[PDB]
């Protein structure tokens, strides 16, 4: 339920975990 963002080579992907 917590959302955090991970970026890879300028491409950001946000991933929610719990």
Q: What is the 3-state secondary structure (H, E, C) of 1-18?
A: CEEEEEEECCEEEEEEEC
Q: Are 15 and 1 in contact (CB under 8 A)?
A: no
Q: Are 16 and 2 in contact (CB under 8 A)?
A: yes
Provide the β-strand partners of residue 12.
7
Question: How many residues does this entry show for the chain?
Answer: 18
Compute the Cα dihedral for 5, 7, 12, 16 and give only its sign.
negative
- Give phi and psi for 3, each to the nearest 5: -110, 135
* Experimentally determined by: NMR
Q: How far apart are CA 5 and CA 12, in angstroms?
A: 7
d(CA 18, CA 13): 16
Rg (C-alpha) for the chain, rounded Å, is: 8
Cβ neighbours for 5, distance < 8 A, ≥ 6 positions apart: 12, 13, 14, 15
């Amino acid at each position: 339920g917590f959302c955090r963002c991970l970026c890879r080579r300028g491409v950001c992907r946000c991933i929610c975990t719990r």
